[PDB]
Design a protein around this ligand. Structure first.
Ligand SMILES: *[C@@H]1O[C@H](CO)[C@@H](O)[C@H](O)[C@H]1NC(C)=O
Lengths: 224, 211, 384, 339
């Protein structure tokens, strides 16, 4: 029954503030110190801030020390983090965690309970939808090496793009890559599938790109 | 000012094998080190606190230890469920906890060469004023593939990005996609494009190209 | 139809009384009644239970060259203290290498002991005690049991006779407004109210119920500094108030109560003491009444006393001879208050004699007894 | 029984004792933690640092006890276990940390045993042991016949109960014999144990070892070492330092031999010889053991009095018209009236 539930988060422009919160249940809230930990995509865990029981002591990471404020409400059984003047570098998945002591000065303990972090994104970009640029197989030279075909999903801002083939009918041999942030501030990802070269002349392959945040769906046919 | 350092990157091992992860501070922080385990899409789980003490629900397979200033995490026998990224932590006896960079445990497999496919820019993209050349590497086992882009037989860098998938759940292999970003105006100034792939599963570097 | 007869009996036990019933138009009859048991039961409302307290002390936290923080906990009579400049030792040597800023955090709290489920005393408020009594009634040779509450507004019917008992002439009880019950003993004590007890005294640790998690305690528990490197948690605490009380209980009400009240617990009650008196009213049905002319005739009657002595017992022996031509029963009653008759009625058949014991303070004893429809005079010469 | 695994992953421990014999304090394997005397029949429940009925191999054996010996648990004969106060006590049963024994009156309590090296170990605590009187008569022993009155006892049962002692991971244990001086260097001997060390020696001389370690260019007096990474769990005794702010609980052990209310037998004083005077009752009291005499009037003013009767005492009481009630020891009360 012991759990932590993160809330808040979302997309903001640089220089704007965002407030995060964490609800606690299954344990006594004011008996333990609590911390915020953030994990940027492709990166390890970084401690952001923390607060002792009864708010007796507060600490911050040097990178956020003059920008972030941490507080807790022991009546609401919740932890809060107020982030001001957010920078692009502050983009990360933010977790709340419960310590095993009440003071933060005990070095014997770690954090036994972690919640489900909420994503915070900081960027000077609009919620632009993806463009799909189909990648035809080089069937003229790879016919004896098995055919590889795919689609490039480019120039979209929001993270959660879903890509599938033949409306989910084709899952075998499908490789969907992690999106990579471009210098433009927009994401780009590719999706490819490996198929028998003999199938290219009889089977039509469709790349189905579903972008929830922009209510946009693109069905692109891939052919030599 | 003081950072924790773990093993350089990742450890490849089979199920039933033994894994040791070492974590050290550049300067002494505390008498104890915590260990965490994280799987993709999941929150970190505490395995060890107080250097030696296992958390409830954690199997005897995990054991804390150390030598000199260097603390270790040992898995006596890997299970299929023990493949995760492990982190080490110290507190400085204050709220400012610090973490190591993270050590990933990968599934052991035999070495297989990548299948390399090159995808020229589509007509739709070129008409958009931009171009993208994609070099696809399928089903290779060593994660550290080396891919370079060449234009008109000249080496280029700083104008491309790479994305690598997680280890496959059935074949235990990786897939890599390298994308070269060019403007339409510059794309048309060149006659040949090529992807140079160097890999441990290859007897020699393989180059694929198009005009 | 019925006749209501009223008598008053002293609130004693084991002493028989003769009730004379004489409804106009009917022959007088004697009813034999005895009070066998008197019980008074207070209504009890538990305020709290007192028991031995258990002092619980966890391992002391020793922080080498650093300051330990104290937390405020909600445990009963919780005590916490942080001591600095401590250099604790274990069997194999000093606990800390760095002694520049050693700090020890000591904690203690008070819990209910295991014995609080076995060895405890209940503090009750006692009020509005209910009085009841058990009467033995003998009518026409038939011994019946009558039980009723002695309030004056309660009655029971036995053999078609309604017995109204009370009100009692006194509402006095051996139990005070505040009592404490321990096992089989009850004490009258002005115990302290919940939430405001005193250390070393009864009620130092209190709970509303044996299973309650809400526990009050005041033991004046103070943590003391460690003895120069010794690892321990020394403290000053008041002696258990329950243990103190148990030794200082003194005599229980079973031995100290007035009027000879017997005291028992589970339920708490006072039994068979001489407190005031108990009025009794009996509804006697018309079927229970007969005329003098309806009685059988007795003849050839006489009385003699072969011997009489002066003693606390009934050392005198009076024998009344009678003859009857028909079998039947006759009522018997003394015509004087100097000498009573143990038999309310007699059975008469053929030719026989009945023996009645008696006592007197006078050397010359004379009395008359009415038997059935006639009277017989008795006399005796009594000696030391 | 042997089905109690609450000690399966636990160990005995050494702890401070104010008197280990000859008035000198020490750290002892039989150090007392506390004494429980809630029983009314005089039975004491004694909690000690050693564990009885358990072998060092974690197997059950009622003939053996295990005690701590320089980091390692060690076996000892249970037959060598003793408890005494002013005189030797009779042990009624044992389990783990708890010893049940019936002791004679005294101001101290001592517990001890013979170890694997044939060395006697003991711990003495101050303890005012003076059993309560059950009923109104005193005795030195239980009679074959007498009155049955309720009193508290400790039940000879090892069955699980609701009262438990917490078991925590023990602290690092300092040991000055881990270090030795070899020329200008300090050597740390592990003997299979994990050792934590700290020094004032130049260089990175702080850390852990599982193997022999040498610290160069310094003396033993500048180093400290303790055994860490314990595998068995230990009771969180107040005499043993905690290594964590809220401790580190690993398990719990139930407290054996629960308190219960049982029937207890007490002697009856022989009936007195009674004669009467003028509004007076005369009693000749010839008790074998000290007997309480008490009486009250049956009137408004009970005039309650009580006294202890030793032997051959003649008592004359005034008897009121309401009657006099006299209680003689554990006998039913007598009622007297004027003659
Ligand atoms: C005896 O103990 C039980 C609980 O073990 C309790 O319920 C009962 O009331 C006690 N009896 C007496 C006379 O105290």
């Amino acid at each position: 029954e012991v759990q932590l539930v993160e809330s808040g988060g979302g997309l903001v422009q640089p220089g704007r503030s965002l407030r995060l919160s964490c609800a606690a249940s299954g344990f006594t809230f004011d008996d333990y110190a609590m911390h915020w930990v953030r994990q940027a995509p492709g990166k390890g865990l970084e401690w952001v801030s923390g607060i002792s029981w009864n708010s007796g002591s507060i600490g911050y990471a040097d990178s956020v020390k003059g920008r972030f404020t941490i507080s807790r409400d022991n009546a609401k059984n919740s932890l809060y983090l107020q982030m001001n003047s957010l920078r692009a570098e502050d983009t990360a998945l933010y977790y709340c965690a419960k310590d095993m002591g009440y003071s933060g000065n005990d070095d014997y303990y770690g954090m036994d309970v972690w919640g489900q972090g909420t994503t915070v994104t900081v960027s000077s970009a609009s919620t632009k939808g993806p463009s799909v640029f189909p990648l035809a197989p080089s069937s003229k030279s790879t016919s004896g090496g098995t055919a590889a075909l795919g689609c490039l999903v480019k120039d979209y801002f929001p993270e959660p793009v879903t890509v599938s083939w033949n409306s989910g009918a084709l899952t075998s041999g499908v490789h969907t890559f992690p999106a990579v942030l471009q210098s433009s501030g927009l994401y780009s990802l590719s999706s490819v599938v490996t198929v028998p070269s003999s199938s290219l002349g009889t089977q039509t392959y469709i790349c189905n790109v579903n972008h929830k945040p922009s209510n946009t769906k693109v069905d692109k046919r891939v052919e030599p | 000012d003081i950072q924790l350092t773990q093993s350089p990157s990742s450890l490849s091992a089979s199920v039933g094998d033994r894994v040791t992860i070492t974590c050290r501070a550049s300067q002494r922080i505390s008498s104890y080190l915590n260990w965490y385990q994280q799987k993709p899409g999941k929150a970190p789980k505490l395995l060890i606190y107080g250097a030696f003490s296992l958390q409830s629900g954690v199997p005897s397979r995990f054991s804390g230890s150390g030598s000199g200033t260097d603390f270790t995490l040992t898995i006596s026998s890997l299970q299929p469920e023990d493949f995760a990224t492990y982190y080490c932590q110290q507190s400085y006896r204050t709220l400012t906890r610090t973490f190591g960079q993270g050590t990933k445990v990968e599934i052991k497999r035999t070495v297989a060469a990548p299948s390399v496919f090159i995808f020229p820019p589509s007509d739709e993209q070129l008409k958009s004023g931009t171009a993208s050349v994609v070099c696809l590497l399928n089903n290779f086992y060593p994660r550290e593939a080396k891919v370079q882009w060449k234009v008109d037989n000249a080496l280029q860098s700083g104008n491309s990005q790479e994305s690598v998938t997680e280890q496959d759940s059935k074949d235990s292999t990786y897939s890599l996609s390298s994308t070269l970003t060019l403007s339409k105006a510059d794309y048309e100034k060149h006659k040949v494009y090529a992807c140079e792939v160097t890999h441990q599963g290859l007897s020699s570097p393989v180059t694929k190209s198009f005009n | 139809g019925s006749y209501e007869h009223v008598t008053v009996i002293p609130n004693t036990v084991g002493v028989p009384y003769k009730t004379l019933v004489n409804r106009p138009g009917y022959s007088p009859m004697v009813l034999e009644m005895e009070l066998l048991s008197v019980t008074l039961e207070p209504t009890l409302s538990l305020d709290y239970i007192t028991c031995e307290y258990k002092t619980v002390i966890p391992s002391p936290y020793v922080k080498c060259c650093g300051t330990a923080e104290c937390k405020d906990k909600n445990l009963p009579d919780y005590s916490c203290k942080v001591f600095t400049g401590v250099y604790p030792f274990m069997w194999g040597g000093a606990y800390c290498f760095c002694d520049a800023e050693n700090t020890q955090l000591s904690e203690a709290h008070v819990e209910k002991s295991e014995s609080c489920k076995t060895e405890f005393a209940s503090a009750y408020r006692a009020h509005t005690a209910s009085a009841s009594a058990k009467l033995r009634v003998l009518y026409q040779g038939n011994n019946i049991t009558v039980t009723a509450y002695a309030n004056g507004d309660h009655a029971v019917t036995v053999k078609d006779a309604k017995f109204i008992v009370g009100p009692m002439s006194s509402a006095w009880t051996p139990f005070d407004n505040k009592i404490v019950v321990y096992k089989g003993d009850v004490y009258n004590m002005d115990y302290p109210p919940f939430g405001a007890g005193r250390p070393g005294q009864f009620g130092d640790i209190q709970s509303r119920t044996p299973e309650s998690k809400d526990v009050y305690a005041n033991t004046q528990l103070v943590l003391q500094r460690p003895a120069a490197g010794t690892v321990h948690v020394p403290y000053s605490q008041a002696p258990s108030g329950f243990k103190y009380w148990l030794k200082e209980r003194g005599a229980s009400l079973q031995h100290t109560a007035p009027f000879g009240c017997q005291i028992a617990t589970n339920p708490v009650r006072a039994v068979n003491c001489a407190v005031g008196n108990m009025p009794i009213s009996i509804d006697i049905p018309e079927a229970a009444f007969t005329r003098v002319v309806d009685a059988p005739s007795l003849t050839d009657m006489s009385c003699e006393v072969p011997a009489c002595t002066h003693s606390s017992d009934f050392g005198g022996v009076a024998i009344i001879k009678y003859a009857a031509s028909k079998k039947g029963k006759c009522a018997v009653h003394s015509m004087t208050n100097a000498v009573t008759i143990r038999e309310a009625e007699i059975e008469v058949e053929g030719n026989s004699q009945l023996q009645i014991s008696f006592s007197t303070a006078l050397a010359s004893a004379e009395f008359r007894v009415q038997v059935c429809s006639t009277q017989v005079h008795c006399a005796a010469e009594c000696h030391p | 029984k042997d089905n109690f695994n609450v000690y399966k992953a636990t160990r005995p421990y050494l702890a401070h004792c104010p008197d280990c014999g000859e008035g000198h304090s020490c750290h002892s394997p039989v150090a007392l933690e506390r004494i429980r005397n809630e029983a009314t029949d005089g039975t004491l429940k004694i909690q000690v640092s050693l564990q009885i009925g358990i072998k060092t191999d974690d197997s059950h054996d009622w003939t053996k006890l295990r005690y701590m010996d320089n980091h390692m648990p060690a076996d000892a004969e249970r037959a060598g276990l003793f408890v005494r106060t002013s005189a030797p006590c009779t042990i009624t049963g044992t389990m783990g940390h708890f010893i049940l024994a019936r002791c004679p009156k005294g101001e101290t309590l001592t517990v001890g045993f013979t170890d694997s090296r044939k060395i006697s170990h003991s711990c003495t605590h101050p303890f005012h042991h003076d059993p309560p009187v059950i009923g109104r008569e005193k005795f030195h022993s239980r009679p074959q016949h007498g009155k049955e009155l309720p009193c508290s006892t400790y039940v000879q049962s090892t069955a699980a109960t609701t009262e438990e002692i917490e078991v925590h991971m023990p602290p690092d244990t300092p040991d000055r014999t881990l270090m030795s001086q070899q020329s200008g260097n300090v050597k740390i001997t592990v003997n299979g144990q994990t050792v934590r060390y700290k020094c004032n020696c130049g260089g990175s001389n702080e850390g852990l070892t599982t193997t022999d370690k040498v610290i160069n260019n310094c003396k033993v007096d500048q180093c400290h070492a303790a055994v860490t990474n314990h595998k068995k769990w230990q009771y969180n005794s107040p005499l043993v330092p905690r290594n964590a702010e809220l401790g580190d609980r690993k398990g719990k052990i139930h407290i054996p031999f629960p308190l219960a209310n049982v029937t207890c037998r007490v002697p009856k004083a022989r009936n007195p010889t009674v004669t009467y005077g003028k509004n007076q009752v005369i009693m000749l009291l010839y008790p074998d053991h000290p007997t309480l005499l008490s009486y009250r009037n049956m009137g408004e003013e009970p005039n309650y009095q009580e006294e202890w009767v030793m032997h051959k005492k003649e008592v004359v009481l005034t008897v009121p018209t309401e009657g006099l009630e006299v209680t003689w020891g554990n006998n039913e009360p007598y009622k007297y009236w004027p003659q």
